[PDB]
Amino acid sequence: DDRVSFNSGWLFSKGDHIDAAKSEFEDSRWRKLDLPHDWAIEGPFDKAYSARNGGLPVFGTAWYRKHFTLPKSTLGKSVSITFDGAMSNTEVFVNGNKVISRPFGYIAFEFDITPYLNSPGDENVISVKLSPENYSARWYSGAGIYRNTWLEINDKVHIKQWETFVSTPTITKDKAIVDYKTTVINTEKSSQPVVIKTSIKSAEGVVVDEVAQNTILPANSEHKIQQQLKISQPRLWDTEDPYRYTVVTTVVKDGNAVDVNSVPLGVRKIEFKADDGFWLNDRRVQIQGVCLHHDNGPLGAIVNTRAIERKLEIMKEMGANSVRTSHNPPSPELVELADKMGILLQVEAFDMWEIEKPAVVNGYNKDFAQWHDRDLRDMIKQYRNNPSVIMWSIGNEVMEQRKDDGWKVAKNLQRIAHDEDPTRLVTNGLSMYPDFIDKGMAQEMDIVGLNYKAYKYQEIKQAHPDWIIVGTETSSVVSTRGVYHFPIEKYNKHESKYVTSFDVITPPWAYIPDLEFENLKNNPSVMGEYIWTGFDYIGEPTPYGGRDHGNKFYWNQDWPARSSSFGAVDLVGFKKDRFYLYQSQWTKKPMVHVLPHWNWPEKVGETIPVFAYTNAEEVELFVNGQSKGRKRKGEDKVRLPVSLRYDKSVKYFDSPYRLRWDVEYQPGEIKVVAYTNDKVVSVKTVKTADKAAQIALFPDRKILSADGYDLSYITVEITDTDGNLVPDADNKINFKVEGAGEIIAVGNGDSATTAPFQADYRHAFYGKAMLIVKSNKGMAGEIKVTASAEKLISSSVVLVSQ
Numbered sequence: 020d021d022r023v024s025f026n027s028g029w030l031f032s033k034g035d036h037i038d039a040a041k042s043e044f045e046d047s048r049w050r051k052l053d054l055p056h057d058w059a060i061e062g063p064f065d066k067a068y069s070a071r072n073g074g075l076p077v078f079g080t081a082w083y084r085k086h087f088t089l090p091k092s093t094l095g096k097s098v099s100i101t102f103d104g105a106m107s108n109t110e111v112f113v114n115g116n117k118v119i120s121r122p123f124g125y126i127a128f129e130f131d132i133t134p135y136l137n138s139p140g141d142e143n144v145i146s147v148k149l150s151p152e153n154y155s156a157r158w159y160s161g162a163g164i165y166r167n168t169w170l171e172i173n174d175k176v177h178i179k180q181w182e183t184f185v186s187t188p189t190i191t192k193d194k195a196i197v198d199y200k201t202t203v204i205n206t207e208k209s210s211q212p213v214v215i216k217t218s219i220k221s222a223e224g225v226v227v228d229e230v231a232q233n234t235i236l237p238a239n240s241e242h243k244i245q246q247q248l249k250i251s252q253p254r255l256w257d258t259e260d261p262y263r264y265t266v267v268t269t270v271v272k273d274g275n276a277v278d279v280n281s282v283p284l285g286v287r288k289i290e291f292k293a294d295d296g297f298w299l300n301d302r303r304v305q306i307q308g309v310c311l312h313h314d315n316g317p318l319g320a321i322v323n324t325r326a327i328e329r330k331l332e333i334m335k336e337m338g339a340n341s342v343r344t345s346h347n348p349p350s351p352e353l354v355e356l357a358d359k360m361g362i363l364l365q366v367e368a369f370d371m372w373e374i375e376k377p378a379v380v381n382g383y384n385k386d387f388a389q390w391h392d393r394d395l396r397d398m399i400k401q402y403r404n405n406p407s408v409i410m411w412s413i414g415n416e417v418m419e420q421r422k423d424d425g426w427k428v429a430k431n432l433q434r435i436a437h438d439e440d441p442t443r444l445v446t447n448g449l450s451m452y453p454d455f456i457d458k459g460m461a462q463e464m465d466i467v468g469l470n471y472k473a474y475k476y477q478e479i480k481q482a483h484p485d486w487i488i489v490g491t492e493t494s495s496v497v498s499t500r501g502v503y504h505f506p507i508e509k510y511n512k513h514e515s516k517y518v519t520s521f522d523v524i525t526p527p528w529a530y531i532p533d534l535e536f537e538n539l540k541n542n543p544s545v546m547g548e549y550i551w552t553g554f555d556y557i558g559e560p561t562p563y564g565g566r567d568h569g570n571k572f573y574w575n576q577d578w579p580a581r582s583s584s585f586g587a588v589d590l591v592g593f594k595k596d597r598f599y600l601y602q603s604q605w606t607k608k609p610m611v612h613v614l615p616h617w618n619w620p621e622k623v624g625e626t627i628p629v630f631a632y633t634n635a636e637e638v639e640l641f642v643n644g645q646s647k648g649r650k651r652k653g654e655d656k657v658r659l660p661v662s663l664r665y666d667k668s669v670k671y672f673d674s675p676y677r678l679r680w681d682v683e684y685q686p687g688e689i690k691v692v693a694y695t696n697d698k699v700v701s702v703k704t705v706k707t708a709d710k711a712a713q714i715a716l717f718p719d720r721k722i723l724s725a726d727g728y729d730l731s732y733i734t735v736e737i738t739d740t741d742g743n744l745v746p747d748a749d750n751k752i753n754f755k756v757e758g759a760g761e762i763i764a765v766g767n768g769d770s771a772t773t774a775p776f777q778a779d780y781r782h783a784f785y786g787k788a789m790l791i792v793k794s795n796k797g798m799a800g801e802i803k804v805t806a807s808a809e810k811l812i813s814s815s816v817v818l819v820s821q
């Protein structure tokens with residue numbers, strides 16, 4: 020029967036608890052909460068925790084406990100529990116019996132609890148112990164049961180979870196052939212004659228094909244099944260049409276369906292051409308991808324369907340069409356949303372392999388030898404049916420790149436992926452030049468994944484023509500929303516602990532996106548890129564605190580810098596100037612964007628740089644009505660400083676992807692006019708804002724589901740009387756939520772603050788703050804949101820829960 024959520028009614032408590040694995044245990048005073056849950060985001064921030072991991076308590080022992088009772092109708096039934104993810108080093112007990120011991124924190128695991136249950140109707144206790152260690156992550160991991168949990172009651176004859184595998188070996192205009200595999204389990208102590216039905220269902224519920232198999236299952240047995248079906252005139256899954264079928268497996272026993280298993284099916288042709296990029300359904304699709312870490316800003320590492328959906332919507336708005344799950348298996352909700360939103364996925368399994376990355380002594384390296392096979396296979400088993408997945412990845416910047424025998428591990432890992440999923444190619448984030456060429460790791464990979472090697476694309480492709488190449492990790496330029504430093508120079512750090520939004524500051528291994536656009540244009544055989552990153556994430560405050568490839572783990576010299584600056588948007592999804600630069604390269608809808616803002620009272624009469632990003636042909640800049648020149652994109656190049664790790668002769672790059680003026684600052688307004696074919700196609704005006712005066716609220720969604728999980732992201736802006744955003748506003752805004760909802764978190768994208776994420780107040784960060792309102796489960800009605808700040812006009816908005 021169909022599973023239910025197991026998230027409700029848990030107990031939680033930090034520290035060591037001897038005897039907490041036993042049913043009889045004094046947990047009466049333990050804190051009550053529902054899952055998913057991430058205790059590290061609750062803080063507080065402490066300088067004793069490395070800013071590389073966000074300066075939050077992402078390690079230490081903690082326990083979860085849940086009391087649950089099953090109906091008396093569960094007698095003679097199978098009962099299984101699935102944890103989609105637990106961070107990290109998880110041990111699970113059922114009525115004192117140990118059932119799970121899984122170190123990997125990004126993988127889903129399932130465990131049969133039928134042998135350990137008490138009698139139907141009597142209470143059961145499940146105990147979860149997590150023991151994450153310090154010095155184990157290069158970014159913020161969070162801590163706790165951060166992914167959803169599930170309980171399923173099944174017939175003793177049922178389909179094994181994650182063993183159903185479907186693919187399309189042959190696709191023509193007339194038909195698609197569907198290869199099928201499944202495993203049925205018979206946990207009965209006698210033989211069971213059953214019929215295993217396998218149906219392909221359209222979205223409208225039409226059985227477009229069906230086969231069956233009469234079989235006698237031996238007692239306490241497993242039976243593998245292979246079938247082949249046909250879909251006539253199949254509606255393809257595509258970036259422009261994410262249509263999916265459904266494969267339904269039914270265990271029929273004595274004429275009655277006793278178990279029903281469903282998996283998704285997307286019909287699409289994938290082809291990787293070594294000299295012509297990536298092809299989807301017989302046409303080339305340029306990979307315009309972004310890397311994302313798993314956390315959700317103020318929500319921490321917890322999964323939330325709406326938060327993930329919102330991130331994918333904002334990345335698609337930027338023009339992105341692909342996501343790389345850096346550097347770990349994603350939640351099932353992310354992959355499900357990517358299926359329905361037509362987003363191509365590169366699902367990555369590991370960060371490091373067995374050799375530790377510098378100063379990360381407690382990472383996955385300690386478990387790699389024992390767990391790499393099961394963890395890699397389980398990631399593939401869980402997501403091989405999702406049509407959004409177009410390739411697997413086995414690692415990222417692994418230390419084995421400079422080992423003589425490092426290629427053997429890559430070959431062995433790739434062999435495991437090919438065995439579990441023979442239908443997809445495998446890539447790997449290569450970074451140590453020229454080691455990954457000299458020592459043969461790149462030779463072993465299906466797809467050569469290059470990290471920050473754009474200026475080497477031509478040389479590498481000419482020496483190895485038959486290689487399939489992608490930029491697995493590109494740029495890594497950093498910036499802070501609303502921050503501008505003058506003059507535009509390539510410094511290393513700033514006193515403000517923020518980075519200029521003119522997008523020129525790069526770590527020694529990094530470069531500006533212009534250099535990636537240029538080398539992707541000059542080497543069209545490369546299928547595309549995955550930028551680092553699409554969203555800001557907690558931890559790795561580079562250039563502050565430290566650099567990833569150093570041998571020092573504590574990054575607290577620049578405290579309280581604890582969040583990243585690699586993102587094209589900030590921690591809550593506010594668009595940086597970087598967002599519009601990528602929109603100028605990845606979208607076709609006419610747009611124009613200008614930076615910086617026009618509030619510089621200490622610059623009257625002085626010269627100031629002005630940048631314009633557009634996908635149009637020309638842009639003319641106006642300052643208080645006076646034209647400052649009509650520039651032509653691609654012809655009037657912008658000289659920007661660079662510093663390339665493996666090419667020290669290059670000091671500057673003349674980018675044809677930006678436009679620059681240098682004008683005298685006078686308060687008033689600026690305006691950019693975008694021209695294509697000598698006619699106006701886009702206009703953007705930015706006025707000098709007056710004194711801060713009022714609050715403006717912008718909910719992205721006003722209609723929410725009353726499920727207790729749906730969220731509304733309410734943009735909070737500090738403006739003047741005319742509504743112009745005050746670029747430097749830092750007012751403390753107070754929030755009140757009445758009705759069928761409540762505050763769940765707040766943020767503002769500030770990378771160097773210790774302000775709480777769980778509070779009813781938040782400072783504006785360069786004019787903007789974010790209030791996350793959550794629905795309440797089972798109560799529908801109005802949700803009234805009020806924002807207040809002293810010396811400003813308050814604001815109110817009304818939402819509705821259904």
Ligand SMILES: OC[C@H]1CNC[C@@H](O)[C@H]1O
Binds near residue numbers: 346416492
């Ligand atoms: O520029 C920072 C990136 C370097 N490459 C690995 C990523 O996870 C991240 O640390």
